[PDB]
Design an enzyme around this catalytic site. Structure first.
Site, PDB file in Angstrom:
ATOM      1  N   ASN A  69       4.056 -14.998   1.402  1.00 56.79           N
ATOM      2  CA  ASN A  69       3.619 -14.272   0.223  1.00 56.79           C
ATOM      3  C   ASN A  69       2.268 -13.603   0.435  1.00 56.79           C
ATOM      4  OD1 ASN A  69       5.911 -14.784  -1.375  1.00 56.79           O
ATOM      5  ND2 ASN A  69       5.167 -16.878  -1.597  1.00 56.79           N
ATOM      6  N   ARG A 101      63.454  -1.733   4.095  1.00 60.19           N
ATOM      7  CA  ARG A 101      64.842  -2.120   4.018  1.00 60.19           C
ATOM      8  C   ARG A 101      65.730  -0.912   3.959  1.00 60.19           C
ATOM      9  NH1 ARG A 101      66.879  -5.755  -0.853  1.00 60.19           N
ATOM     10  NH2 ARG A 101      66.473  -3.841  -2.023  1.00 60.19           N
ATOM     11  N   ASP A 145      46.463  -0.374   4.249  1.00 60.50           N
ATOM     12  CA  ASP A 145      47.706  -1.073   4.555  1.00 60.50           C
ATOM     13  C   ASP A 145      48.976  -0.243   4.354  1.00 60.50           C
ATOM     14  OD1 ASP A 145      49.298  -3.253   5.235  1.00 60.50           O
ATOM     15  OD2 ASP A 145      49.302  -4.066   3.278  1.00 60.50           O
ATOM     16  N   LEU A 160      57.519   0.992  -2.589  1.00 61.47           N
ATOM     17  CA  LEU A 160      58.611   0.543  -3.433  1.00 61.47           C
ATOM     18  C   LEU A 160      59.387   1.673  -4.039  1.00 61.47           C
ATOM     19  CD1 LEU A 160      56.805  -2.333  -5.245  1.00 61.47           C
ATOM     20  CD2 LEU A 160      58.296  -2.411  -3.231  1.00 61.47           C
TER      21      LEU A 160
HETATM   22  N1  LIG Z   1     -10.665 -20.081   5.046  1.00 68.64           N
HETATM   23  C1  LIG Z   1      -9.689 -19.421   5.749  1.00 68.64           C
HETATM   24  N2  LIG Z   1      -9.260 -18.249   5.247  1.00 68.64           N
HETATM   25  C2  LIG Z   1      -8.296 -17.561   5.907  1.00 68.64           C
HETATM   26  C3  LIG Z   1      -7.684 -18.093   7.144  1.00 68.64           C
HETATM   27  N3  LIG Z   1      -6.761 -17.210   7.559  1.00 68.64           N
HETATM   28  C4  LIG Z   1      -6.769 -16.202   6.678  1.00 68.64           C
HETATM   29  N4  LIG Z   1      -7.688 -16.423   5.696  1.00 68.64           N
HETATM   30  C5  LIG Z   1      -8.218 -15.230   5.042  1.00 68.64           C
HETATM   31  O1  LIG Z   1      -7.073 -14.451   4.764  1.00 68.64           O
HETATM   32  C6  LIG Z   1      -7.331 -13.051   4.869  1.00 68.64           C
HETATM   33  C7  LIG Z   1      -6.282 -12.300   5.673  1.00 68.64           C
HETATM   34  O2  LIG Z   1      -5.206 -11.937   4.815  1.00 68.64           O
HETATM   35  P1  LIG Z   1      -4.055 -10.933   5.223  1.00 68.64           P
HETATM   36  O3  LIG Z   1      -3.416 -11.702   6.341  1.00 68.64           O
HETATM   37  O4  LIG Z   1      -4.583  -9.578   5.402  1.00 68.64           O
HETATM   38  O5  LIG Z   1      -3.274 -10.855   3.897  1.00 68.64           O
HETATM   39  P2  LIG Z   1      -1.711 -11.043   3.768  1.00 68.64           P
HETATM   40  O6  LIG Z   1      -1.023 -10.281   4.866  1.00 68.64           O
HETATM   41  O7  LIG Z   1      -1.253 -10.553   2.459  1.00 68.64           O
HETATM   42  O8  LIG Z   1      -1.459 -12.523   3.844  1.00 68.64           O
HETATM   43  C8  LIG Z   1      -8.705 -13.001   5.533  1.00 68.64           C
HETATM   44  O9  LIG Z   1      -9.657 -12.776   4.520  1.00 68.64           O
HETATM   45  C9  LIG Z   1      -8.912 -14.377   6.087  1.00 68.64           C
HETATM   46  O10 LIG Z   1     -10.253 -14.788   6.262  1.00 68.64           O
HETATM   47  C10 LIG Z   1      -8.179 -19.402   7.602  1.00 68.64           C
HETATM   48  O11 LIG Z   1      -7.712 -19.941   8.639  1.00 68.64           O
HETATM   49  N5  LIG Z   1      -9.148 -19.987   6.868  1.00 68.64           N
END
Ligand SMILES: Nc1nc2c(ncn2[C@@H]2O[C@H](COP(=O)(O)OP(=O)(O)O)[C@@H](O)[C@H]2O)c(=O)[nH]1
Ligand SMILES: [Mg+2]
Length: 1084
Positions: A13, A572, A609, A616
């Site tokens: 998500n 037939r 088919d 018929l």
């Molecule tokens: N605290 C922390 N935050 C994270 C970590 N991984 C991702 N986030 C934060 O999530 C964001 C990246 O989100 P992104 O992958 O672009 O968004 P998505 O594709 O919608 O999930 C960045 O701001 C990261 O710092 C983590 O290992 N620790």
């Protein structure tokens, strides 16, 4: 060669952190990741692709700091994965561990051990990890190791089931194509030139019918390009994934929006062809981006308000409405947008437009306080499961609406979300208005429906409910009045002797209904009700004369009463009675089948088919309104295209199948059907397409037109084959029926006269050369010979028949004025009669009459002509050196043409009247009137055609007066310099048909009793030369029409003498059935 590329699908998500996860490890962001080259697809946003167009590993990413709620949110994702690739590997990774207490870690750990890792319905998550942060970690090192090793394990799993590993070998030519598709620079990356590109790279995978389809199949599965296979932008439009995704995603973000305003924006964003724009909108529907509302509007499901609008429904007491619930563990992704698309077409009147409202999670249709419908999602406390609620008012129209809604819901799930088929169906009821509703499963109501009882309160018998109010769709209360089963009419036993057949649906018995023979399908304990209603949906709305209709349905024993065929199936008949299979009957059968196909194709239904076992017959009587019908609408007889087992069925498959049916009809022996007995050759034969000549191979009487139709129909290329509409149009033809034979003559052969032997061959003259050359045609073998018999060009031939003397001779009149007489029984017996003083212009013969160019008429005694140098009985001077005789007709008084006068003779050869026809110039036009007479037809009036006239004169021989004119130009003027309108020959049939040939390839059929045009037969050949009436050796009467077809081609066409009648009878037949089609469709 050992292909080493695999896709990586990353899902989760919005806000999961999955892109940064990918970053450290290394709608949809697609990039390569060489480790083994992975084709990584990062589903960044809500890219519906995972449902709109779902060798891959799944990475499930979720935010651990959110917790168990997020874990539950991933169930729809896991469902969807299992639903399309249960065998594919899934790695579950929790993120944000560095901001998530281990409490949550172990909470979610126990959550997945309790609800996913050990839970069926989810694609057995192969492994899982937790990650602190995308800065790097030991967890990530382990994850990388896991991804690698597990992807290797997965391909091992594929080898165990599929038979393929991560170095599985694929045809190298497909690999080459991948590279060729990589190297593409196009402004609007839509590809059709691929055919050329195949030719650029030499020509690999040359089996266009098999290897090409496999390459394309591979190219989508491998993530190289996109086919879109019933769209128009499908087969010939390969589109770059980056553009497909990008543009459609953008437009979503660029909630009811007018189509036109979308078009305006799009035209500025990317200048697509309007044709492509129409397909663009169709793609928006198919990819769930936007749904069509009115023809000018789009719904755009995504982004619709998710705050169910305040709706006050009319009706409040419990008994005023009907409520139905669907309990689900979670809604599948895209469930709602698909559901909405289907529900938008609901209408209680299909058997004013509604005030529609949209909740994203529901639809409200208004129509009227009398009948309205609300469908939407509702959730109750302490009941995790989400669910649907359907509300309609309790009356007939309300019932109809309910039936449509639940049919769409169940169909939706069967096609798109199988596995659920969970879906606990509850009905709500109460025994007193003002109280609370009670729940009951529909299965239990079905148990009660079988009893037919009222729902009875087990604690208090005084409280009962008539089942129909709770569930009017279990009892078939939404049927059209026309098909409600009248139990006082239906008479049946279900006894063994009435069993007509069976199947997975149950069984079929013979029965009586309203005094007629009917067949009864019984759904004898086979997931009934649902199958029953599916059949009811299909049967209704299809009301064509060539289909088997439904004669009432009834839930009490779960039956479909349908029409029973009287004469049985075609197969037939083909094997049991060729005597019934006349040429007329055969044609009518072909028409009736063709109509059914046209209808079903317009209804978007592929039959798949068409064989003799499905046709018929309801009466063998040739002249009946309805003869053949197609059974059960909605083996070794397959199109070679679909026979490959790697394409999709469409109308062209049915057309091909039809052609085979027609071939089977043509050869009444069912010779290819007999070939079925040796199926190893039969199925392959059809695949080869190398069918033998139906005439030569089986000894089948010629039937041109049909013969070429079959050839036109059975083509290898689906795009070359005729549409079913066209097939019908071709079958709808009197010419089709009455043309019997067509013989082409040798190139550069010109025949100026014909003599058929009345006893099966034709003597032909020859005006091509300047030498007396006599030709001969054998109709039995279409044999042809020719020899020079005289000096000057032969002008007229005549047959002298002396059955008394047991002999016959051909008299050849020529330009020199001589008469060469040749014995038909002995080519050596050739002799010449007294030479004429001028050329011979016409012959008739009993006396041999010789009309010469100087207007002289010689009369020879019947037998005398046998002797060489014989003189005529007597000679008459009718015309003069400039007024040649040109026609001796007789239908025992003679009539004929001499210049511009019409003469007549007694049996003493005396002139009985010289009618000067020059006076006709007071009418019409003097240059038409003043012209030599070509032919005289003698009936109850004389019909005169003059040289180069476009008008036929009608004369009253009893008073010698002009009684009418026939304008040939006018008739073809009505028809939309081949149209010269020149009259060539006149033939007359005693059934009032008048046959008029002309300068161009047209034959007019006129009605002598009214002087009216029956029909124009045309596009015959270049020009008509002569027409004869002749009896064949089978005693059948036919027209022999000899024409030019300039490449000096010429040919003989043989027509069934009853053509005039067939034209009218066919027309009537078609019209009657046309009216019946409207009658049926209108009743509904
Ligand atoms: N605290 C922390 N935050 C994270 C970590 N991984 C991702 N986030 C934060 O999530 C964001 C990246 O989100 P992104 O992958 O672009 O968004 P998505 O594709 O919608 O999930 C960045 O701001 C990261 O710092 C983590 O290992 N620790
Ligand atoms: Mg992202």
């Amino acid at each position: 060669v050992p292909y080493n590329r695999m896709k990586l699908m990353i899902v989760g998500n919005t806000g999961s952190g999955k892109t940064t996860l990918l970053q450290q490890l290394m709608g949809i962001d697609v990039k390569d990741w060489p480790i083994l080259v992975l084709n990584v697809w990062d589903f960044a946003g809500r890219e519906e692709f995972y449902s709109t167009h779902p060798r891959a590993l799944y990475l499930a990413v979720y935010d651990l700091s959110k917790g168990q709620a997020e874990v539950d949110a991933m169930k729809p994702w896991l469902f969807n994965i299992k639903a399309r690739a249960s065998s594919s590997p899934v790695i579950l990774v929790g993120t944000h561990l560095d901001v998530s207490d281990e409490k949550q870690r172990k909470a979610c750990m126990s959550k997945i051990t309790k609800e996913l890792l050990n839970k069926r319905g989810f694609p057995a998550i192969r492994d899982y990890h937790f990650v602190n942060a995308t800065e790097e970690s030991d967890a990530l090192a382990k994850l990388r190791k896991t991804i690698i090793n597990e992807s290797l394990n997965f391909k091992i799993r594929d080898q165990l089931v599929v038979g393929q590993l991560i170095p599985d070998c694929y045809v190298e030519l497909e690999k080459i194509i991948l590279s060729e598709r990589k190297n593409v620079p196009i402004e609007f990356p839509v590809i059709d030139r691929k055919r050329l590109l195949q030719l650029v790279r030499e020509n690999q995978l040359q089996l266009d019918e098999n290897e090409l389809p496999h390459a394309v199949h591979f190219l989508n599965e491998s993530g190289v390009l996109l086919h879109f296979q019933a769209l128009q932008l499908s087969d010939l439009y390969f589109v770059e994934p980056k553009w497909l995704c990008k543009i459609m995603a953008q437009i979503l973000t660029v909630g009811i929006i007018s189509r036109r305003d979308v078009e305006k924006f799009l035209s500025k964003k990317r200048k697509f062809p309007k044709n492509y724009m129409s397909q663009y909108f169709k793609l928006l529907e198919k990819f769930q981006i936007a749904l069509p509302i009115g023809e000018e509007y789009l719904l755009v499901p995504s982004s619709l308000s998710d705050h169910r609008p305040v709706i006050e429904l009319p009706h409040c007491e419990n008994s005023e409405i009907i409520i139905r619930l669907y309990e689900m563990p979670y809604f599948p992704m895209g469930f709602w947008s698909r559901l909405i698309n289907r529900l938008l077409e609901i209408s209680p009147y299909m058997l004013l437009r509604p005030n529609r409202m949209y909740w994203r999670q529901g639809i409200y249709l208004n129509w009227s306080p009398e009948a309205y419908c609300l469908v939407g999602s509702e959730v109750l406390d302490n009941h995790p499961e989400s669910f649907l609620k359907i509300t309609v008012p309790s009356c007939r129209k309300g019932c109809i609406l309910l039936g449509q809604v639940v049919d769409h819901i169940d169909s939706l799930m069967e096609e798109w979300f199988p596995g659920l088929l969970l879906l606990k169906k509850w009905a709500l009821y109460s025994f007193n208005d003002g109280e609370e509703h009670q729940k009951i499963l529909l299965d239990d109501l079905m148990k009660k429906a079988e009893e037919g009882d009222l729902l009875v309160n087990p604690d208090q018998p005084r409280l009962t409910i008539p089942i129909s109010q709770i569930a009017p769709d279990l009892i078939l209360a939404d049927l059209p009045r026309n098909i409600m089963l009248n139990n006082d009419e239906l008479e049946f036993e279900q006894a063994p002797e009435f069993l007509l057949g069976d199947g997975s649906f149950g069984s079929v018995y013979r029965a009586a209904y309203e005094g007629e023979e009917v067949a009864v399908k019984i759904f004898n304990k086979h997931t009934s009700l649902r199958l029953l209603r599916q059949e009811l949906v299909v049967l209704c709305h299809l009301h064509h004369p060539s289909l088997i209709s439904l004669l009432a349905a009834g839930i009490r024993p779960r039956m479909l009463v349908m029409e029973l065929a009287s004469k049985g199936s075609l197969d037939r008949l083909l094997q049991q009675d060729k005597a019934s299979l006349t040429r007329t009957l055969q044609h009518r059968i072909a028409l009736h089948v063709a109509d059914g196909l046209r209808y079903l194709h317009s209804a978007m239904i592929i039959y798949r088919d068409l064989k003799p076992h499905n046709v018929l017959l309801f009466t063998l009587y040739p002249n009946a309104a309805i003869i053949a019908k197609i059974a059960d609408y909605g083996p070794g007889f397959r199109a070679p295209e679909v026979a490959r087992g790697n394409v999709i069925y469409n109308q062209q498959a049915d057309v091909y199948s039809f052609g085979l049916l027609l071939y089977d009809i043509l050869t009444t022996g069912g010779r290819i059907v007999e070939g079925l007995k040796f199926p190893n050759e039969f199925d392959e034969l059809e695949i080869q397409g190398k069918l033998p000549d139906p005439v030569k191979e089986y000894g089948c009487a010629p039937w041109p037109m049909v013969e070429k139709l079959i050839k036109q129909c059975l083509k290898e290329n689906p795009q070359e084959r005729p549409t079913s509409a066209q097939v019908f149009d071709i079958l709808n033809s009197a010419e089709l029926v009455c043309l019997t034979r067509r013989i082409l003559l040798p190139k550069n052969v010109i025949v100026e006269c014909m003599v058929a032997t009345h006893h099966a061959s034709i003597w032909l003259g020859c005006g091509h050369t300047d030498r007396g050359q006599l030709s001969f045609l054998d109709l039995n073998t279409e044999g042809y010979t020719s020899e020079e018999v005289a000096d000057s060009r032969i002008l007229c031939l005549a047959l002298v028949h002396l059955p008394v003397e047991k002999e016959s001779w051909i008299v050849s009149g020529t330009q020199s004025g001589t008469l060469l007489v040749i014995n038909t029984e002995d080519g050596k017996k050739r002799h010449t009669l007294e030479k004429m003083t001028d050329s011979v212009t016409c012959l008739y013969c009993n006396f041999l009459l010789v009309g010469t160019a100087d207007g002289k008429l010689a009369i020879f005694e019947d037998k005398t002509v046998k002797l060489k140098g014989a003189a005529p009985l007597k000679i008459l001077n009718i015309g003069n050196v400039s007024t040649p005789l040109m026609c001796l007709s007789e239908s025992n008084v003679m009539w004929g043409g001499c210049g511009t006068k019409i003469f007549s003779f007694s049996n003493d050869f005396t002139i009985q009247k010289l009618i000067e026809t020059r006076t006709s110039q007071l009418f019409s036009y003097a240059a038409f009137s003043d012209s030599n007479i070509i032919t005289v037809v003698v009936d109850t009036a004389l019909y005169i055609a003059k040289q180069n006239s476009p008008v036929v004169e009608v004369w009253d021989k009893k008073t010698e007066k002009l009684c009418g004119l026939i304008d040939c130009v006018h008739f073809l003027r009505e028809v939309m310099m081949s149209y010269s309108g020149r009259v060539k020959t006149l033939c007359l049939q005693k059934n009032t048909a008048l046959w008029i040939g002309t300068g161009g390839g047209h034959i007019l059929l006129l009605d002598l009793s009214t002087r009216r045009l029956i029909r124009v037969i045309y596009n015959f050949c270049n020009s008509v030369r002569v027409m004869m009436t002749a009896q064949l050796g089978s005693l059948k009467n036919v027209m022999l029409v000899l024409g030019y077809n300039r490449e000096i081609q010429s040919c003989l066409t043989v027509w069934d003498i009853n053509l005039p009648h067939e034209v009218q009878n066919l027309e009537k037949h078609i019209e009657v059935r046309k009216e019946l089609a409207e009658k049926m469709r209108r009743t509904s």
